[PDB]
Amino acid sequence: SFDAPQWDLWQSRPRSEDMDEALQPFMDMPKSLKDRRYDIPWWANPFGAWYLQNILSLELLKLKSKTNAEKIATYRSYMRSLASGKDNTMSDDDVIRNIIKERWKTLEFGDRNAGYPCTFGDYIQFLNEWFKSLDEEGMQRLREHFDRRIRPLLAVMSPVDILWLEALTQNSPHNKEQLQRKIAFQTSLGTPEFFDMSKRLRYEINEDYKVRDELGPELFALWSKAPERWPPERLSKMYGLDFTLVRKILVWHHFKACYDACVEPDWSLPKRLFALEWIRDVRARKHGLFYGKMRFAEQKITFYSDRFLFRDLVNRREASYANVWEMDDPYRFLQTEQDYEDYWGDNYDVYRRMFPEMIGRTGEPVQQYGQMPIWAGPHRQHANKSEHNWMFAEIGVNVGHEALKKLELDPTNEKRRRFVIRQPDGTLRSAKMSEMRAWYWKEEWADFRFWAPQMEWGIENTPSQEQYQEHVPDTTDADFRKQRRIQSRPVKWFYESHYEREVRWPDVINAA
Amino acid sequence: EKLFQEMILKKDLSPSRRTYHCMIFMHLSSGEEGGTARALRYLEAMERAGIQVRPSLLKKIVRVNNAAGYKRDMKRRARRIMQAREEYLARKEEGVSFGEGGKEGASNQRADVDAEGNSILEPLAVSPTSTLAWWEKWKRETVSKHELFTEEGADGTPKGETFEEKNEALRMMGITSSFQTKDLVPQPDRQKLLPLIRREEGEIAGSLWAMDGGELSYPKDGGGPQGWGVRLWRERQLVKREYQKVLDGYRPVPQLSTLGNSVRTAGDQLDIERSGAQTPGELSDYRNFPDNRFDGGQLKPESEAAPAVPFSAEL
Amino acid sequence: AIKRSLNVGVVGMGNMGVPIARNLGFKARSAMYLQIHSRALSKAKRVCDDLSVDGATCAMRIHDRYSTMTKWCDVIVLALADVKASRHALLEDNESLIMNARKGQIIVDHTTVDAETSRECAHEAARRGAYFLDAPMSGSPRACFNGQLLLMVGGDAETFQKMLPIFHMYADNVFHMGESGSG
Amino acid sequence: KVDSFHANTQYQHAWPLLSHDDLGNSDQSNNTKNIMYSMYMPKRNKGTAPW
C-alpha cells in the first residue's frame, strides 16, 4: 500500500550520510562542520535560488502558460526599449536565450547582503552536493560535458589564465591586487588568436560525439534488423568512418543499453563482432612479466617465390570471405538458439581451437562399440564399470605420425588410428575430435577466411577421370581391394552352405 | 571482351601490357564467380606470349583481390537473401507462422512454473522507458527483414548500399534518418588536431568510450608527471605547433571562438556583435571597408563588392 | 519481459558473507549476475579479485551504495554481524533496501536479529509490495565453505520454493518454519 | 586470516581488444613500424617453450 514517489531534478532523492565527498576541500573538512550542515532543498542554497530565479524560470517560459506569454511580451518590450536597431525582429526563444546569456554573464561571488546573490563557498557547496546526487549516468553526462566544452578551453589556456579565472571566482580585491603587481601574470595572458583554436578542437570533439551518439542508433538499427543486408563492412564503406570504429559503436551501444536498464550484458557480442580479434589478441596475462606478439603463426615459404604458390593463394582468396559473421554459411550449422548460445557464450575459445580451418561443424559424431562376450558370465560383468573414463589410443609403425594427422583421423580411412573410451558405466565409445587431436602435437592457428564450398570448379579446376585412370588400378593385377571386400562382408553363409546352388527363401509346407 | 577478341582475331593486333592489366583487374574487381579464374587465363596469355609480368602486377593482383573480397561477399550474401525472401513468401502463404505465433509451450509451461510444477525465480521486468526495452519493442513490432526490398540491386548486390534505399528502408522501419545524404556525414578523416593529440599524448576525451565508468582515460589526481598539469601543458604545446602552422599559412585561419571573443578588447567585441563576423578576416573586411556594411552595422555578403579593374590587364 | 539471468546481490562481506558470496560465485554457472556490497569498496574489490583469480562461473559487480544494490538486484541476501548493522541497512538508512524496495524483490536476512526487527521488516516489505524472508544461519565459516549450513526460513512458502535453489548453494539443512518470525 | 594476506600477486588483467604490444607493436596492415624479437631470445632452449 506504498506508492514510490517519482524522483527528478526538481526534488532530489534522499541519499545516505556515509557518502564520500566529491570535491577536494570537503574531503579534508572536519566532521563537526559536516554535522553542522542541515538537510535543505536544492533551491534553499543561494546559488540554487539564483539559478531557479533567473535561469530556470526563463527556460520554463518556453511553455504554453499565459504568464509566460506576458513575461515574453514584457521582455520583448524591454529589449526593444534598450536599443531598437540591434534586435529588431526575433522570436521568443531568441529573447529567452539572450536574457539567459546576459544573466549568466553578470554572475559574481560576494556577500549575500552586499548586492551579490551568493558567495563562493555556497557555490562550492552547491557543486559538492550536486555531484553527490549523481548516478553513474549523471557522472557520465558530467564527464561528457567536460570533454565537449571545458576540455578544449583547458587545452588552450595557460595556467596563468587559470589563476586569473580563479581570481575572478574568488572576487577578493586583495587577491586581485596581489596578483596584479606581478609582471609575469600580466604579460603571459593568452592572445585571442591562439584562443581561437579551442573552437576547432571543440568542433572535433563534438564531431566524434556526433559520430557516437547520432550515427550510432542508425548503425545499430541497420545492423540489428538485417545484418546480412547491412554488414559492418558495408556500413563502413557507405558511411566512410572506419571498420573497427563501427564495430566499437555497435558494441558500446549494446552494452550501454544493457548497463542503463540493470540488465546483464550479452557477453557474446564482442566475440561475434571481433571474432578474429578475439582469437588473435585476447590472452591471459600474468603479473610480473612482459609479453610479445607473433608476426606469423608458422615459419613458411613465401607465395611470391613461385608462380604456382601465387596462383594457389589467389585461387584460395577467391574462395574465401573477407569478413565472416554469425549469419554466413560456415555458421549455418547453428540451427538451434541453444547451440548459438553454447557456441558464442563462454566456450568460443575452446570451440574455435578445435579445428584450424572453418568447417561445417565443430567436431565429429560419437559412436559406440560392442563389448566382446565374457564367458565367465555375470561373475565378471562388474569389472568393466569403474570410477573414471578410461581412454586408450593406438601406437605402432603405421600410427602416430604428425605429418599424417588429418589422414590418421579421417573417418573415411580404413586404416584410421583407433581410439576407445570406456565410460564408468562400462560403455565402449569412440573418441571425440578434440580427444583424437589431443594425442598429437599442438596446432594453435585458425583460418577465418577460406570456405571450401566457394571453390571454383568450372574453368581451371577440372579434375578428370583420365588423370585418375593414369595410375591404372586393376582388380586382376592386384586383389587387395577384393580381399578387403571379402573381409568386410558377413560370413553367415558358411554355416548354411549345405542347407550352381543359390540361396532361396524357405519354402513353407503348411501354406502349400 | 568483345572488343578484345575483335582486336586479336580480326585486326590481328598484339595487345599491350596495359590492356592486359585492364582485363585482369576488371575480372578481379568484379565479384562474380570465376573472375579470378579468368584473370589467371589472362595471366597465362601474358606468360605464353612474351608479355612482361612485373612484381608490381602481382602485388596489385593480391591487393585488388583482397579489396574486391567485399564485392564477392555481397554477391554471395545476396543469393541467401533471395532464398530467404522466397522462403518467407512461401511460408507466409502456407500459414505456418500463424500456427507458430501461438505460444502453447509458454502457456502450458508458464514463466513461474517449471516442468514438474515448482515455483522458479522470475527476473523482474525492466522499465519500459529504458533504451533496451524500446529496442526490443522495435525488434518485435516493426516489419520483417524480408519485406524491406522486393528486388535486389542492379549488379548482384543487395539493396541498401545507396542512401535512397537506406532512407526508404528506415521509413519502412519507422525511423526518420537525420543524415539523408553524405553531406551530413561527420567524416573523422578530415580531423587534423585531434589525431595529432591522440597519437602523441593520448585520448583528449577519455569518457568517449565508457561502459560503466571505468574505461575512461584521464590523468591521475596526485600530480607529478602523470598529473593534469603536464598533460595540459603538452596539449597546449601541440596546439601551439598547430597555431604556428596557422601563422605560416599551412592551415586556414580559424573562426572567432567564444573564449577568444571574451578575452578581446571590448571595442572588438562590440564590432563583432554588431557585424556578425565569424572569421577575423570578415572583421578586417568590416573595418577596412566601412562603406560596405548596412545601416544597422550588419556585414554585407561578399558578392555585393566589386573592385576596380585596371586597364593594364588588357596588355 | 526481457529473457535474462537473475540479479543476485550479497550485502556485507564479513565473517560469513564472504563464503556465501564465494559459493554463489562458484556454484552458479552463468545463471545469475552476482552483486557484492560492502561499506568499503576495497573489500568488495578484494572479494571479487579472489573470486576471479580462483575462477568463478559468473560475472560479478561491486557496489558501494544501497540504492544501486536496490535498483539492480532481483534477489538481495544480507549476511551481517550485528543487529544494528542489519537494522541500519534494512530500515534506518535513507537508501535502505526495504524502504526503497521495488515491486517483486525478495530480501533474505541471514543475520540473527530480534523478533520485532524481523516483524517490522516483513511488514514494511509487504507494504512496499516486495517479499522478506528471515533465515538465521547456523554453522561455521568452514561449514559454509563446505555448503553445510542450517537455515530456518520464515516468510512466504512460494518465495521459499523460489529461493531453495539459491539456498542449496551454501546451505544443506534448509527448513521452512512457517510465517515471518518463526526462524 | 590466511586468505586476506594471499592477494593476486600472480595474475594480471587480460589484453583488451585491438591492444598493442608491450614493445609497442600492433596488428595493422603496415608492419614496417613493428619488429620481430626472435633474435633477442637465446639461441637454444633446454626443453620446449609454450610458443
Binding site: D20, A22, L23, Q24, M27, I55, R97, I100, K101, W104, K105, L107, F109, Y123, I124, L127, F131, L142, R143, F146, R148, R149, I150, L153, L154, I162, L165, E166, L168, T169, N206 | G214, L216, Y218, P219, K220, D221, G227, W228, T258, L259, S262, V263 | S42, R46 | A7, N8
Partner: peptide, 30 residues
C-alpha cells in the same frame, strides 16, 4: 594493493567561472 582513482580533479575544474569566458557553457549548446 592498487586503487583506481575516482578522478576528483574532474570536479575541481568546475569550480572556475566558465560563464565569464564561455558565456553560458553550463546550458545547452546552440
Amino acid at each position: 594493493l592498487n586503487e583506481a582513482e575516482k578522478h576528483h580533479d574532474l570536479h575541481m575544474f568546475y569550480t572556475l567561472a566558465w560563464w565569464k569566458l564561455g558565456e553560458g557553457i553550463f546550458g545547452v549548446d546552440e
